[PDB]
Amino acid sequence: GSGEAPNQALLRILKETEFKKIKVLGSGTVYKGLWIPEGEKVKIPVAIKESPKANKEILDEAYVMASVDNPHVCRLLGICLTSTVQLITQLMPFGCLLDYVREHKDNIGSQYLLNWCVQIAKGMNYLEDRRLVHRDLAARNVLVKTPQHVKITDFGLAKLLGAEEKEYHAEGGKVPIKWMALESILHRIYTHQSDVWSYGVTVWELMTFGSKPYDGIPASEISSILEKGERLPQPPICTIDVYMIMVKCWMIDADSRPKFRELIIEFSKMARDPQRYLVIQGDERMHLMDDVVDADEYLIPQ
Known part of the structure; x- marks a missing residue:
């Protein structure tokens, strides 16, 4: 090989x-x-x-x-x-993106949200090219240089896969369950496609302006909720087009989830007509040594 x-x-x-x-x-x-x-x-x-x-x-x-x-x-x-x-x-x-969207919720428009989705997918696609599985993607782990430029951070759980290695098998470390793919919860298996699941949750965090996923649900119960087919709800600003991408990231078959390179394409297309894809009150006005x-x-x- x-x-x-x-x-x-x-x-x-x-x-x-x-x-x-x-x-x-x-x-x-x-x-x-x-x-x-x-x-x-x-x-x-x-x-x-x-x-x-x-x-x-x-x-x-x-x-x-x-x-x-x-x-x-x-x-x-x-x-x-x-x-x-x-x-x-x-x-x-500007700190982490989660806190940023919570603090500036009344001034975050569709163009910013969709561009952030593109940029996060670009960073993840690059990590995939490097055979790096991040294992802790979440809005708390995206940092804001400017409203127009975000970057992925927190490589404390990240792992480098070998050229012929498809998965990272974890031991018993603590891991954020509400962002994890089902196969990671059940079997401690991590791949680029389980990062895609976490990407979907991250997008959901953004699209809700920083809601907590499965708020008030014990992490112990998340595994069974997912197995019965339930997922995070459609955020009110999200058209079905945007929610479909999120749902696809939460398919049980990891190989049926989108690839980061496809997420770049899909969100970049939407970013060309943002109000067609996110329906936000006041979207028009929203705005963020030598x-x-x-x-x-x-x-x-x-």
């Missing part, structure tokens, strides 16, 4: 003196700050995220993030091996 090519990604090790924490974003503790590579005359806005297991898991996450490079996947700039390990990534000023350089303009030799 086919073999594996070497992974020549470079893991950049940053010195603590090169980056400055400016303020806490959340809580390990994540800080907003600036990375100032010496003699380079640039200030890059960064997020700085500061137990042997915890250390092993953050290094596995750094390893995956160092191995991805795509406009719709979050950028790792490097790691800092201080007493406490630090992960330095591009600052995404040396500072965004990470997307700070290219590091590969």
